[PDB]
Each structure stands twice: as C-alpha cells, then as structure tokens.
Amino acid sequence: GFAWWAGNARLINLSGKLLGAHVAHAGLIVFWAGAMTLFELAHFIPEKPMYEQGLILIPHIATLGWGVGPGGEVVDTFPFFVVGVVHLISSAVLGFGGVYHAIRGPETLEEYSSFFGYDWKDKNKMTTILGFHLIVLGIGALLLVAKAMFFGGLYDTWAPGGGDVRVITNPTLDPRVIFGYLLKSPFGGEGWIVSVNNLEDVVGGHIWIGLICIAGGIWHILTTPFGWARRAFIWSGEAYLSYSLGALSMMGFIATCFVWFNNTVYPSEFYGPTGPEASQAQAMTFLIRDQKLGANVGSAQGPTGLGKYLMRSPTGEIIFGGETMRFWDFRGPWLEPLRGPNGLDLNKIKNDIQPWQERRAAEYMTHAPLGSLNSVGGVATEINSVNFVSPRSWLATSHFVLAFFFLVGHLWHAGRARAAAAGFEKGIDRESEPVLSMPSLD
Amino acid sequence: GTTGERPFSDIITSVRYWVIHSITIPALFIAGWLFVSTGLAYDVFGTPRPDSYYAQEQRSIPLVTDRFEAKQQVETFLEQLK
Amino acid sequence: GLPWYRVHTVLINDPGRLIAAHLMHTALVAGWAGSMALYELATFDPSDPV
Amino acid sequence: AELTPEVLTVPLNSEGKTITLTEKQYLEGKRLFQYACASCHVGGITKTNPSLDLRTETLALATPPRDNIEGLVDYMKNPTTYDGEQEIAEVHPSLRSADIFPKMRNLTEKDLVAIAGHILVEPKILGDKWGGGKVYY
Amino acid sequence: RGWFDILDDWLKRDRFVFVGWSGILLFPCAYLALGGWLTGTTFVTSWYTHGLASSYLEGCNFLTVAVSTPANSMGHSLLLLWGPEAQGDFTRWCQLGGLWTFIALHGAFGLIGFMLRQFEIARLVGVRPYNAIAFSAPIAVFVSVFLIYPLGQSSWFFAPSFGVAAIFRFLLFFQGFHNWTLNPFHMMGVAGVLGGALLCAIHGATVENTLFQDGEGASTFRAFNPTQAEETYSMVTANRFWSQIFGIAFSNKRWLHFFMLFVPVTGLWMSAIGVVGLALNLRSYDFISQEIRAAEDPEFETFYTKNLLLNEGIRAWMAPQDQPHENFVFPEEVLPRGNAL
Amino acid sequence: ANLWERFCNWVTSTDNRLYVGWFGVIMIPTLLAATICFVIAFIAAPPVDIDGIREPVSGSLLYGNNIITGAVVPSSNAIGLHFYPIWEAASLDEWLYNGGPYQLIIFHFLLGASCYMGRQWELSYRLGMRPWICVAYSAPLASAFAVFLIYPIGQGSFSDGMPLGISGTFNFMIVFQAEHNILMHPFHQLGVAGVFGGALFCAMHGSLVTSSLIRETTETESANYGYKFGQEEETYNIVAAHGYFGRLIFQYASFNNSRSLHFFLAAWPVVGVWFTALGISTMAFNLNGFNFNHSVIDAKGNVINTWADIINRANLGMEVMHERNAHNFPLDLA
Numbered sequence A: 001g002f003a004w005w006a007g008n009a010r011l012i013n014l015s016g017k018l019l020g021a022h023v024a025h026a027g028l029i030v031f032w033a034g035a036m037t038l039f040e041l042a043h044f045i046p047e048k049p050m051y052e053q054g055l056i057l058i059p060h061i062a063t064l065g066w067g068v069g070p071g072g073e074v075v076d077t078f079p080f081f082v083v084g085v086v087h088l089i090s091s092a093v094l095g096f097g098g099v100y101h102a103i104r105g106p107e108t109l110e111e112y113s114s115f116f117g118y119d120w121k122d123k124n125k126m127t128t129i130l131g132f133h134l135i136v137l138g139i140g141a142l143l144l145v146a147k148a149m150f151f152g153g154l155y156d157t158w159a160p161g162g163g164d165v166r167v168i169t170n171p172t173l174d175p176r177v178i179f180g181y182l183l184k185s186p187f188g189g190e191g192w193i194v195s196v197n198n199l200e201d202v203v204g205g206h207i208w209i210g211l212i213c214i215a216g217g218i219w220h221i222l223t224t225p226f227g228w229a230r231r232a233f234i235w236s237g238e239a240y241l242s243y244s245l246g247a248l249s250m251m252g253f254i255a256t257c258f259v260w261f262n263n264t265v266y267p268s269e270f271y272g273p274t275g276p277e278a279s280q281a282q283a284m285t286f287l288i289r290d291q292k293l294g295a296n297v298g299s300a301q302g303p304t305g306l307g308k309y310l311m312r313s314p315t316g317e318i319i320f321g322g323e324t325m326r327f328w329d330f331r332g333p334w335l336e337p338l339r340g341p342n343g344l345d346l347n348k349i350k351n352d353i354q355p356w357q358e359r360r361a362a363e364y365m366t367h368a369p370l371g372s373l374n375s376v377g378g379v380a381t382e383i384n385s386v387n388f389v390s391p392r393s394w395l396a397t398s399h400f401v402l403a404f405f406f407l408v409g410h411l412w413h414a415g416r417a418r419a420a421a422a423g424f425e426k427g428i429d430r431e432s433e434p435v436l437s438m439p440s441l442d
Numbered sequence B: 001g002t003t004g005e006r007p008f009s010d011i012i013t014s015v016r017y018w019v020i021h022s023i024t025i026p027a028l029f030i031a032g033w034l035f036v037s038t039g040l041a042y043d044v045f046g047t048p049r050p051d052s053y054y055a056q057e058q059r060s061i062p063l064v065t066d067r068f069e070a071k072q073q074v075e076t077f078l079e080q081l082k
Numbered sequence C: 001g002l003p004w005y006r007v008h009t010v011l012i013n014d015p016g017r018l019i020a021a022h023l024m025h026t027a028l029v030a031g032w033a034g035s036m037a038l039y040e041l042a043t044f045d046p047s048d049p050v
Numbered sequence D: 001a002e003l004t005p006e007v008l009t010v011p012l013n014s015e016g017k018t019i020t021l022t023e024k025q026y027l028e029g030k031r032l033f034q035y036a037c038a039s040c041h042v043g044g045i046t047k048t049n050p051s052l053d054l055r056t057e058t059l060a061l062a063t064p065p066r067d068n069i070e071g072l073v074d075y076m077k078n079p080t081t082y083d084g085e086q087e088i089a090e091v092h093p094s095l096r097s098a099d100i101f102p103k104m105r106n107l108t109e110k111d112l113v114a115i116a117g118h119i120l121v122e123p124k125i126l127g128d129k130w131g132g133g134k135v136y137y
Numbered sequence E: 001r002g003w004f005d006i007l008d009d010w011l012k013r014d015r016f017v018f019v020g021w022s023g024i025l026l027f028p029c030a031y032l033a034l035g036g037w038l039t040g041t042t043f044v045t046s047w048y049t050h051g052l053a054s055s056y057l058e059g060c061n062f063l064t065v066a067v068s069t070p071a072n073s074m075g076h077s078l079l080l081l082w083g084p085e086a087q088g089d090f091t092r093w094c095q096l097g098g099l100w101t102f103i104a105l106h107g108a109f110g111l112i113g114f115m116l117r118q119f120e121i122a123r124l125v126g127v128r129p130y131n132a133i134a135f136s137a138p139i140a141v142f143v144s145v146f147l148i149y150p151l152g153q154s155s156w157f158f159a160p161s162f163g164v165a166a167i168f169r170f171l172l173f174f175q176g177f178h179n180w181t182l183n184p185f186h187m188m189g190v191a192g193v194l195g196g197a198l199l200c201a202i203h204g205a206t207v208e209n210t211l212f213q214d215g216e217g218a219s220t221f222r223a224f225n226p227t228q229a230e231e232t233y234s235m236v237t238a239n240r241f242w243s244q245i246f247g248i249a250f251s252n253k254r255w256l257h258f259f260m261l262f263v264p265v266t267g268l269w270m271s272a273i274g275v276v277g278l279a280l281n282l283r284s285y286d287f288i289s290q291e292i293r294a295a296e297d298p299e300f301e302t303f304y305t306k307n308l309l310l311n312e313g314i315r316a317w318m319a320p321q322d323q324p325h326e327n328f329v330f331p332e333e334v335l336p337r338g339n340a341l
Numbered sequence F: 001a002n003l004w005e006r007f008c009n010w011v012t013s014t015d016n017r018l019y020v021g022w023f024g025v026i027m028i029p030t031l032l033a034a035t036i037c038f039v040i041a042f043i044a045a046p047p048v049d050i051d052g053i054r055e056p057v058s059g060s061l062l063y064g065n066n067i068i069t070g071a072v073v074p075s076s077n078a079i080g081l082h083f084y085p086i087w088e089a090a091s092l093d094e095w096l097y098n099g100g101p102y103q104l105i106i107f108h109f110l111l112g113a114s115c116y117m118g119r120q121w122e123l124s125y126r127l128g129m130r131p132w133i134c135v136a137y138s139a140p141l142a143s144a145f146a147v148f149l150i151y152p153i154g155q156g157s158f159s160d161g162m163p164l165g166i167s168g169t170f171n172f173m174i175v176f177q178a179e180h181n182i183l184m185h186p187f188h189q190l191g192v193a194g195v196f197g198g199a200l201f202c203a204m205h206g207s208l209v210t211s212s213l214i215r216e217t218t219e220t221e222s223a224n225y226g227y228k229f230g231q232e233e234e235t236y237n238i239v240a241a242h243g244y245f246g247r248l249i250f251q252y253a254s255f256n257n258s259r260s261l262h263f264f265l266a267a268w269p270v271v272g273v274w275f276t277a278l279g280i281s282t283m284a285f286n287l288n289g290f291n292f293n294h295s296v297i298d299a300k301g302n303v304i305n306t307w308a309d310i311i312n313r314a315n316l317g318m319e320v321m322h323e324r325n326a327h328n329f330p331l332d333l334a
C-alpha cells in the first residue's frame, strides 16, 4: 500500500521488524553520544573555556560533577573519556540486537511470545508497556538524585567561592516549592520551571518525578483505560506516534528556553553567559570603568533623562540602565553580591566590587551569544578574527528547529490517524461523498 | 512516448560510454586545473594576482575614470606595479 | 452576455461605428488639448522668462 | 603589494634598535593574538575600554613606551595603566596573572615576541583600519 | 517545397529538445548569457570598475561572486568588444565591465527568444498562448530593472550586478536612497508575489485533501490516470470546506486557474512600473505633511520618521565605498550616529 | 435530547454557515478581542514608549498618522517579557503609555490563529476529507509566531517584536538586517526561493490550465461559463498541457500526474516558508547570516572588499542610527 518513500509505514503491524528498527535506532543515538564525546575530548584544550571550543557534551558531563573542581576548572579528563567509550561500546550491542531483530529475527513477535507481542488496539497491553517504561524513567530520574546525594554531588555555580562540586544533603521535598514552579507564570521575572535556581530544588523535583513515574508505571500495569478515556482517544499505532510527537515537540521548546535563560543547570562557566547575562555584564563593565575614573554612577543622568548606569525597574528595583533594562530579571553568581533589598546597592557598588567580578563581567560581555553561521563571533557587522558561536545559541537554535518539525509531525500523524480510523485517509468515496448528502448552506 | 534518441539510463550503464568518458572527463578536469595552476587564467582575464591589487605603499583603488582613455588608464596602472 | 472587458468588440465588423468611435476618441483628445492650453494660459505668469 | 622585510621591520626597544620579523613569526603572532587577545582587541580596538587602542601612536604615548617589542613583551608580563602608575595584572591577561587567565599559561617567550610583532606590523598594513573601529570596516 | 519549407520541417521536428525558428534566437543568447555569468564569476575581477574582488579565482564564494556593472565613467556605453573603449582587447573588455552588457543584452534577446518559443510551441500543439502572456511579467521586471532603471541614472554602474550578494546590496541601496518599501507599486508587487505563493500552497493543499479514492493504496498518487475524464478531487467538498472555514470559496475551476495566472503576473507588472519611476528618482520618499509637523514639533515621532533616520545612516555609511568614482571623503565627525554606537 | 448533547451538536454542526467547532469556541472570542482592540488602537491610541526611554511614538490615525505610517506600537522595553494585562496597570492611561494593547492583540491573535489551524483540521474530519490543509497553514502561522513571540523571547523584549503597522513592519525588517544580516542567512534565501518559486508555479499552473481549456463557449461569453460547478469531467486537457510544457522544456520536466503536480504546488512554498520562519526563529537566538567581512585580503594583508563588505557598510548605517537615544554602551547585544 505504501510507497518506498513511506516505506517505514510498512512496519506498523510487524512487531518483530519494528522492534529491530527501534533498537538499531537507539544504537545510533548511543553511538553519537559516544563518538561525539571522544571527538570533543580529542579536540579539548583545558586552558580555554569550554564555550570557546564548540563543546556541547563535555559541559553536560561536567555539570554532573565529573572532571571538574572549583570554579569549573577542569582537573581530570578521564571521566570524559570513560563516558564516551562506554556509550560507544554499548552501541555495538544495541546495533547487534537491532539488525538481528530487523533482518533475521521473528518478523512478528506475537506468534513467538504473548508477553512481547502486542496489538496496537489492545488497550491493556499498551498501558502495560507504557507502565514498564514509566518505571524505567522513574529509575532514571532517581539516578540523578543518587549521584547528587551519594556519588559526588553536582557542580553548583552558586557555591560560595567561584562555584564548585557540592553534595546535596537537604533536597527540597516541600510540594509547595516543587509544584509551585509548575504554577509560575512563563512570563518575565517568573519563568515557569525555567527559573529553578538552586540544586536543592533540582534534586527534590527529581525525587518527586521518580516516585510519580514509578507510581504511574504501576498504576498503568494494573489498570485498563476508563471509558471516558476510551471514547476520547484514537487507539492505533500512528495515533500513539502522534501523541508522542506532540510531547517531544513541547519538550524541545522547553529545552530551548532552558538553555537560553537558565544558568544553574547550564552553568555559564561551561556553556558561556546567557544573552541577558552578557548584556548585564556590559553595563557592569562600563559602570566599573567609569566609576574608577571618578564618575558618580548613581547620579549620572543619561541622554533620555533615565540613569546612564542605574535606573528603576517598573516595580522600583534599582537596575542596570540602557537597553539592558529589559534584562533586569537576570540573576547570577557574579552579580548577586551587589544586590540588596531594593535592587543593586549603591554602597556595595561604590565599595565592594572585587577584581574577580570585573574579570567575569569583562569575560561575559566579550563572549555574548551573538555570532554568524560560519562562527564569526559577535554582532553581524563585526569583522573576521574571533571564531566563536556560543553553545547556548547552537543548542537553542537546534532544538527550536527540531521541536517545530515534531509539532508539524504531530499534526501530520494525528490528522492521518483520525482519518484512517474513520476510513477516509485514502480519499473520498465517489459513491458516498458526505457533502452531497448534506443540505446546502444557502 | 519517445522521440528516438537513445535513453540516458541506457547510455550511462553501458561499458562503451564509460570507456570514453573515463578519459574525457578527467582530461577536462585536468585541463581546467592547468588553466589555473599554470597562471594562464590570470593573464587571459586580467584578474589581479594576490600581490598585484596595489602597489607596495599604495592604498588607492586604480579606478577607471575615463570612457575612451579607459584602456590606457588600466595599462598605466599595471605599469605602477612592474 | 459580453463581459465588461469586451464591450468594444462589437465594433470589429462594423466599420461605420468603428469610424464613429475613432472620431469620438479624436474629439476627446483635441478637446483635451484645448482645455489644457486654456488652463495653462489662465495660470501662466509671463513676466519673467529668466 | 606584499609582506616585505620593510613591513616586517619594527622597533625592538626605545633606544632605536630594530628587529626584522619573518612571515612565519608574523602569521604565528596573528594566530596567537586571535587565541589570546582578539576577544577584546579585534581590529586593534579595546571592547572593554574603547578609549585605549593598539594604534602605534597610542602605544608610543603610554608610560613605559609600548611602541616597541620590549614595551609590549613587558606589558604582556606585568601590565600597567597608561600612565604606568598601577599594575593591572589582576584584570588584564599577562604571565603574572596566568593563574586567573589560563590562556596565558602556554605562552613561551618567543610567542610573546610574535604577538608583539603582529601588533606593530598590522597598522603598517591596514593603516587607519587598525584601531579605528567600525567607521573603517 | 523550397528551402524555407524544408528548413521549417527540420526546425519543427519532434525531438528531445525542441528547436523551432525561435531556437535560433533563443539558444545562442541563452547559452552566452549563462556562459558569460559562469565565466565572469569564476575568473573575472571587479577591481577596476568597483574596487571589488568578485570571482572564485580571487577568493570569493558562491554568495559574493558577481559579474559587476561597468564603471560609472562608461556612461551607458554598449561596451562592445570591438567598440571604442575596449578596442578589441578581450582582456581589457573584461576589466572594464564588458561582460555586464554582454550578459544583459544577450539575456534580453534570450528572453525574447523564450517567449517566442512559448508562442511557437503553443501554435504547433494547438493550445492557447496564456503561458506566453504570463511570461511578460518576468520580461517587464527584467527590462525595467536591468535596462530602463540604469538608463534613467548616470550609467550602467547603478544597475544590479549579477550576483547573490551584489543583488542584496541593490536591495539595500533602494531602501536607503529611494525608500523603495514606501512605494505602493512595490507594495502591490509584494501582495502579488506573496498572494501568488499563498494561492499556490492553498490550491495544492486543497486538491490533495479533497481527493477521491480511486485506488486502494495508502499512496494516492498511483490512482490518477493522465487520460481519465473524471476530476480527481471534489470541487464540491473543497468549496464547502472553504465556505465554512473562510466565508467564501471558489466555485469555478476556470476562474480559479485564471486568478492564479492573474495575481503574480499583475504584481510583477506593478513593481516594474514603480521601478520605472525610480529610474528618474521619482520616488515615494516622503509624506510632506509628516515632515512639516516633525520639523515644527520635536516630540512628534512615527515609524515613518524612524525609518528615514535609518535611510540616512545607510547613505552616509555606504556611499564612499559603494560609489568610489565620487571620491566621497566623510570625516568621522560628519557621519550620522546615535548615542554610543 | 440531552441539553449538553444538543449544544455539542450545534457546536460541531456541518450545517452552520460558518463552522464553529471546539477550536472555534476559543477562536471566536480571542479573535474578536484582538480585532476590536486593534481597530480601536489603530484609530485612537495615544503615543507609546516602545523603547522604554520615555520617547513616545505616535502610532494612531488621530495622532497624526496615515494608513501607511500608522501602527499599534510594541510594548515598552521597560516591560521586557513581563506580562502586562490591563489589571496590572494603575490605570488605563498607564497601560496606554506603556504599550499594553500590543500584548492584548498579539496574544489573543496568536491563540485565535492557532485555533484557526485546529479548526481547519476539525472541519475536514466532519466532512470526510483528508486532513492536511492545516499543515499548509502552519507555514504562515509559524511565521507569525516567529515575529510576534519567538523573536521577542530570544531578544528579551516585546519591544523588538514586529509592529502592527505598515511602516513599523519596514522598521522591523531594516533593524533585523543590521542586527542579523538575514539576507546572508540561508533560511531566508530558501524563504525567497519559496515565495518567488510559489509565485512562479502559481503563474505556470494557472497559465497551463487556462491554455488548455476545452472549447465550450463562444467568443461573446466568458470562457468561465464552460465550467459548471460540480460537473464530473475535467475542464481542461492535461495531456495537451503536458504536451505543450514538455516541449517547452523537455518531456520529463513536465508532470503528467495531476496529483503529483498539485502536491508539488503545495510542498514548494510551504517548505520554503517553514525555513524562513525557522530563520527568524533561530536568529532570535543570534545565530546570524554568514559573515564574510574582510574575508579576502591581498598578499601584503590589505583588505580587498567584496560585495559582502558593501552590504556591511549598509548594515553599519542601520546599526548606528536605529533607536538613536537608547544605547549608552558600545555593543548592541540585544
């Protein structure tokens, strides 16, 4: 029925060749994660910040606490090697399984075993496979907790003294905090869950998520869908694909904003400064320089009449001036020591800016996530010399693009699933065209 | 539904086709290569070599400013480098 | 019937009324010239050609 | 036009002496300047303090004069403000501050001479474009 | 049975590539326009006319190579190989911009050739010549932009150069100098091109989603026979869908397909007229009433006044390098600049 | 006969002159809210401090604008990405100075258009159609999401979203070119290929069908009366069109299958506009068009300009002029 270019649709009702397709494709994933880490480590120079080197995987490993010490300095590269090799090796085993089940294995599973066999329309079996995978994911989330609490901790950009690897002993359990984030506006100064800003809340939320996932896994093993759910959904392989494409799209969008705004679970030590951070850093940089020359930065009126260096947010908080007035919700470890209760504190500004904060401000203003597709750093009008594009832009853009096509894929397969379920996905039956049996509109 | 020429799919799967075209195709690629590696393409077309956009201490474009003396102006400029 | 953009095709085989139309066009064009000159004369200042 | 020994001949010190660099040293230096300095100093300006640039005329009015190989090598070791009144290694890269600016760790003495030589040669090649900013892009 | 009729027979034979009488104009000119551009983009500088590198030989990539226009000093010279400027020297001709006129003029005659081909093939096969008529829009754009426009100005220098990024610079020149986006002939052109793409997508989508089921396969392409009499999609169901979705829908398959011809062809023709005006610097640059208010009232600001400041930046910052024959020298202090930047 | 079932039956009825549906239940109110606010503000709103510098910009007809220069002006940079509903303002006067209508209009609009896309899926199901017209519309919807939501998210402020005005649109695209160089970005180039190409294929397909209409009328009547709505037979001769177009190019460059032809007509512009929408959306995070500034240098090291450098001169002129009172520091980092 299907053409070569829709050829994978021929696997819909071949559980054995479809198991192979999935497992072989999971091998490609593990393979990429493996090769790419080794490629990054082969290219890694430790005296250069990670974000001057096009690294996206090594920062993920560092953030988990491996390889790094105080301030994000890399101290031991062997955990990066290990993570790549193990992934790499494990892909051969998935690849082996994958081509075995796609080529030589039982083409359908149901004849060989009633446990592994499935029919898409079996609501109990489908909720049972969903149950198993929910548990697996619950376990995965708890592995993050175990690492944070019993196997070294995690990197904490907020730890006093430049940031450091820190073990997490009082995870947040209070559901008001954890589920409070889920209820926060996604808008400015609020951030929905992208505002999470300390590792205690990260680890606590993962305990919850692992329990909820294990409980739901068990729930879905032990139940079958209720009749309101049975009548609400399409129950077909393509329909389940469409639901998951919807979900991954949503998640891709979320991850986009997370790597763009969050500097806790994407430490700027590793990923480079966020857009807001770098903009705030510039205002800081010139406040520092001009004050050193004698400028009274609190009393300097800028051309518009707003403060040149310092003004008020719309709720009163003292903030950086210029266009970065838009970025006053930014919070970061190099800047919070200057915040008092009314926003930025003028006596702290006048007396207590340290050199490390001057360096960090200068470093981040000159490493903002602006650059060209061919990796010329900076604003579009800058000349060639600096080969830099922030990992934050590479990860934000790439995952925006993927998220968008999966929403398109969600629409594609959802509408097709609906039409196939009612039986007109192949077109209109000339002998029974529904419009010809309706009254006309006028 | 054909006009009588030999089908392409038939020609480019044929041993004779590839016997002729494994000589011709590299021969042309090599010729065009030599057009550039020899430096001939510079001289045919008038294109400045990396060292002859400017005279040594000169930062002025040698811009053609005359319609009918144009030819002579270009030549004057080329002297300013030899 | 005829669309709006074809009303004048009724002259294609009517040399009489074709000439009638060409006369009316010619009338309007010469009318224009005369009206345009008179308007320019009523507004022209002739007192400084420099 | 080309990269001749005249272009590559820059002052060694304030006494009057000259060193003549090679094409190798020049391309070496350009490359290390991109590695260690262009994030702030692309094109001979200074992003984080645009009032101070790398134009030869600006360097010659620095205290310690910096329009020679020695001035510049020295600055890369023990930088000072423009009037020479205060050492600024804590906020500017240099070998003295290579703990806090790790990129300076693997710079040999000859790397410093190349970098310094690129700085003095480039304005002879690009003129006003070196240190002039976007007006000359 | 004379030589003319024998030659007619031979030109109009049914072969893989139809020739026709129109092929005698078409094929040489098409091929020389194409050959010139590839030749020049590979080997030929713009140093002497523009101060620009512009070939692969010189280091340019696909986006920056161009066959650039001749120097402003050439005026509107035909710049014939054998003409008074190049005097037959092929090399000089290339350095003076001879390939620009060569490409423009052969391209012009090739476009005539192509439209005559559309007429010639249409007559032989027995169809109406609406595809030829439609092709007048591209011809108007080409002649108005590449020929009329620079003929109204000082020289060929200000026509577009044949290159990706050179055309980008043409786009920005017209914004800064002509405020071309403010021109309603351009606006009608935009509506026609974006209307065209809309109609393209929405008609293709409608048909593919009102298909009749005419075979049994999940791929519905196989269930069309190119000689079936029956429509392959339901006009009635498409019309009901858009009627209830959008309020109105097509009911006449002929008007629909005529409308698809009409929308983009008209838009291009409209933009062509705007460009004819810009040949004479007859722009829609300004709104007089806004300028009178803004001059007298320094608190009055619109998006209209904000875009003219942008145009003023464009002119002052790009003109010295884009118009090198003028020897503009603008000190740092005369350049218009906002605060800080 | 159950009351809710009756309501569910009118909502989803295919006999309503305009289909409502469940998506329509969100679409109708949200689009009326956005429309009514837009019309009122376009006529009568007072000047808005778009860049947060107390430099209000007049957008409406009553404050000295015409149709071409008028706009509903984006909300203040002081607000950034903060949510500014009416009830968060001390007074409607405050809300108006600070740009609150722009937020009301664009959020209702994006919602309502999203539902517009759902509504297209939904009526197709009720009529027994194939489902994908809404995938086509997702190209323009994505493009609207990019200029009104995604780009403001990446840059940190709705003050950099596209104005709801004709000249405001131009301001938006000029400043975009200076800060991103969209022209040198490949996803915009596919957008141009998508839109030029779609206009081309629009004209071709329209000219090819019109060329090959079967004679059904006299010279005195519109050829269009030769098609009767709902007739079974095709109204043109696709073999005559294919025979014409195949000869104009060559045989195998011309479609003989009407289904492939119309799918191709759908796919080309939809895909090119997907890309251009994704280009705006990725330049939202500053992954900009190619930069070849000073890429060609001579043997001494002189810069040898290219057309890319002339582009850069123009871009520089837009950069230094835009929002001329809004920058205090040398880099325009957002």
Ligand code: CLA
Binding pocket: A004, A005, A006, A007, A008, A009, A241, A245, A405, A406, A407, A408, A409, A410, A412, A413, A416
């Ligand atoms: C988990 C993800 C997922 C899964 C399992 C499927 C599964 C399926 N899809 Mg859906 N699809 C998805 C995501 C997914 N899709 C997304 C995200 C979109 C939107 C982009 C679509 C849009 C879509 C359409 C339009 C159709 C399907 C169809 C199908 C079926 C057959 C597909 C096939 O044979 O591909 C065969 C694979 C190819 C022909 C190759 C694809 C080439 C891609 C486009 C190029 C990408 C290149 C990349 C960008 C970089 C290249 C670098 C270079 C060096 C090579 C199958 C059931 C078909 C269907 O309805 O069947 C029921 C169908 O018509 N898919």
Ligand code: CLA
Binding pocket: A003, A004, A005, A006, A007, A008, A010, A011, A017, A018, A020, A021, A022, A024, A025, A092, A093, A095, A096, A099, A102, A103
């Ligand atoms: C991740 C991508 C992916 C995966 C996993 C699959 C997997 C599969 N496809 Mg799809 N497919 C894909 C992409 C993919 N496809 C794309 C892009 C297209 C468009 C061209 C198609 C088009 C397509 C069609 C048209 C059909 C399939 C079919 C199938 C199945 C049977 C293939 C078969 O008979 O092998 C025959 C092929 C071989 C025997 C060649 C050998 C290939 C081997 C596996 C390469 C392995 C090399 C590797 C280095 C070995 C490592 C070994 C070591 C680990 C021990 C299989 C499960 C078929 C199906 O559904 O059957 C009913 C079918 O009809 N696919």
Ligand code: CLA
Binding pocket: A019, A023, A093, A094, A096, A097, A098, A100, A101, A105, A106, A109, A112, A113, A116
């Ligand atoms: C999700 C993936 C998946 C699924 C659902 C199946 C399902 C199946 N396989 Mg396949 N297979 C897979 C992956 C998978 N396999 C992989 C990865 C490989 C390569 C290692 C193979 C190689 C393979 C062969 C060679 C054969 C099967 C066979 C079978 C069938 C019987 C399995 C059984 O009872 O064995 C008994 C089960 C066990 C002894 C399970 C012991 C515990 C496992 C090994 C570890 C689980 C730990 C953890 C979850 C994952 C690993 C840790 C890692 C992540 C670090 C069944 C249909 C047989 C068949 O159908 O042939 C006719 C058969 O001969 N499989």
Ligand code: CLA
Binding pocket: A127, A130, A134, A182, A183, A212, A213, A214, A215, A216, A217, A219, A220, A223, A224, A225, A226, A229
């Ligand atoms: C992969 C995850 C996953 C998936 C696919 C499913 C799938 C399913 N579940 Mg299970 N479930 C899971 C995880 C999952 N579950 C976990 C972890 C738990 C434990 C809490 C449960 C607990 C659970 C129960 C108790 C029940 C189901 C039921 C069902 C079925 C109907 C789903 C439905 O109508 O919801 C669609 C959603 C709604 C109808 C309500 C919308 C509510 C959300 C919160 C609105 C917010 C959306 C917003 C825009 C996004 C932001 C989030 C916000 C909170 C901030 C379906 C088979 C039902 C069933 O038939 O059970 C046998 C049922 O009664 N599930």
Ligand code: CLA
Binding pocket: C004, C005, C006, C007, C008, C009
């Ligand atoms: C000498 C010039 C001339 C003459 C005598 C004709 C004569 C004719 N044309 Mg042709 N035509 C011409 C120039 C000419 N045309 C030009 C320059 C164009 C391109 C714009 C066309 C494009 C054209 C098309 C596309 C069509 C014709 C058609 C026709 C026929 C029917 C016209 C009709 O009923 O209009 C009726 C028109 C009106 C009732 C109102 C039109 C008003 C227009 C829109 C604007 C106002 C004009 C203004 C008042 C006065 C002109 C000022 C200035 C131009 C001098 C008729 C034989 C039609 C045909 O072939 O039918 C078989 C047809 O479809 N013509």
Ligand SMILES: CC1=C(/C=C/C(C)=C/C=C/C(C)=C/C=C/C=C(C)/C=C/C=C(C)/C=C/C2=C(C)CCCC2(C)C)C(C)(C)CCC1
Binding pocket: A020, A021, A024, A025, A027, A028, A031, A085, A088, A089, A091, A092, A094, A095, A096, A098, A099, A102
């Ligand atoms: C089915 C199918 C398919 C697919 C397939 C797949 C997807 C595959 C898989 C496969 C795989 C997925 C593979 C993998 C493999 C791997 C391997 C085999 C590994 C090995 C490794 C090694 C050897 C290592 C070593 C080392 C070390 C240890 C250290 C470091 C260095 C080195 C690296 C050397 C296709 C579509 C084509 C077709 C159809 C069918």
Ligand SMILES: CC1=C(/C=C/C(C)=C/C=C/C(C)=C/C=C/C=C(C)/C=C/C=C(C)/C=C/C2=C(C)CCCC2(C)C)C(C)(C)CCC1
Binding pocket: A177, A178, A179, A181, A182, A193, A196, A201, A202, A203, A204, A205, A206, A208, A209, A232
């Ligand atoms: C980890 C973590 C955390 C936590 C979190 C959590 C806890 C989460 C949750 C989550 C959740 C809990 C989610 C939810 C979701 C939901 C959803 C997403 C839903 C959906 C729905 C839908 C989709 C539906 C549909 C429908 C309708 C509406 C109608 C009927 C039909 C249907 C069914 C189709 C935190 C942040 C603290 C921190 C960091 C980390």
Ligand SMILES: CC1=C(/C=C/C(C)=C/C=C/C(C)=C/C=C/C=C(C)/C=C/C=C(C)/C=C/C2=C(C)CCCC2(C)C)C(C)(C)CCC1
Binding pocket: C028, C029, C030, C031, C032, C035
């Ligand atoms: C009867 C008679 C008489 C009288 C006569 C007369 C009184 C005449 C008049 C006439 C005239 C008094 C006429 C005039 C005409 C005019 C015209 C014919 C006009 C035209 C117009 C046009 C067509 C326009 C168009 C347009 C517009 C409106 C806008 C802009 C564009 C254009 C230009 C296109 C006499 C005593 C001798 C004798 C007896 C008889």
Ligand SMILES: CC1=C(/C=C/C(C)=C/C=C/C(C)=C/C=C/C=C(C)/C=C/C=C(C)/C=C/C2=C(C)CCCC2(C)C)C(C)(C)CCC1
Binding pocket: E031, E032, E034, E035, E036, E037, E038, E039
């Ligand atoms: C001007 C002239 C002339 C003419 C010449 C000619 C005629 C030439 C030709 C030439 C030619 C005829 C050339 C060609 C060239 C070509 C090329 C250079 C190509 C390239 C291509 C490529 C690069 C592609 C690639 C690709 C891609 C990218 C994607 C897909 C795939 C492909 C493969 C397509 C004569 C002699 C009369 C003399 C006077 C002057």
Ligand code: OEY
Binding pocket: A323, F051, F155, F159, F160, F175, F179, F322, F323, F326, F332, F333, F334
């Ligand atoms: O581009 Mn230039 O960058 Ca985005 O902000 Mn800084 O300036 Mn301003 O307000 Mn709208 O615009």
Ligand SMILES: [Cl-]
Binding pocket: E306, F171, F175, F321, F322, F323, F324
């Ligand atoms: Cl502006």
Ligand SMILES: [Cl-]
Binding pocket: A321, A322, A323, A324, F326, F327, F328, F329
């Ligand atoms: Cl600022």
Ligand SMILES: [Fe+2]
Binding pocket: E203, E257, F205, F209, F262
């Ligand atoms: Fe059609």
